[PDB]
Amino acid sequence: AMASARSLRSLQRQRAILKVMNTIGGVAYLREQFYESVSKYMGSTLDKKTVRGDVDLMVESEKLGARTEPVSGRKIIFLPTVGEDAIQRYILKEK
């Protein structure tokens, strides 16, 4: 039985993920650097399970796109409208 405050915190974390994704250019590997950015945006990653949960909620509701980058095996998340050029540029840059 989820208390309303907890649900509100989930929404706050989703807003943070969204704002950070816009700020960092709309494409990110799901890894420590990203979670650290979300933590710093919110004012401060010993947990991370909690934020990952909300990333997952966002992927499932299609607020974020997600896919495995096959060469590295890392998971990429992206703003759905960012464009494949940007995604590939990011993959190339972080190669």
Numbering used by the authors: 543 to 586, 589 to 639
Please give sentences taken from the publication describing this entry.
The τ138 subunit is currently the least well-characterized subunit of TFIIIC. We first solved the structure of the central domain of τ138 (546–641) using the sulphur-SAD technique. The 1.4 Å crystal structure (Rwork/Rfree of 17.5%/19.8%) of this domain reveals a canonical winged helix domain that contains an additional C-terminal helix. This first structurally characterized part of τ138 thus represents an ‘extended' winged helix (eWH) domain35. The eWH domain is moderately well conserved from yeast to human, and contains basic patches that could also suggest a role in binding nucleic acids. However, when we tested a construct that contained the eWH domain with additional residues at the C terminus (546–693), we observed a Kd for the interaction with the TPR array of ∼100 nM. Interestingly, the removal of just the eWH domain is also lethal to yeast, indicating that despite it being dispensable for the interaction with τ131 in vitro, it is still essential for proper TFIIIC function in vivo.
The six subunits of yeast TFIIIC are partitioned into two DNA-binding subcomplexes (τA and τB). The binding of these intragenic promoters by TFIIIC permits the assembly of TFIIIB, upstream of the transcription start site, which subsequently leads to the recruitment of Pol III, the formation of a PIC and finally to transcription.
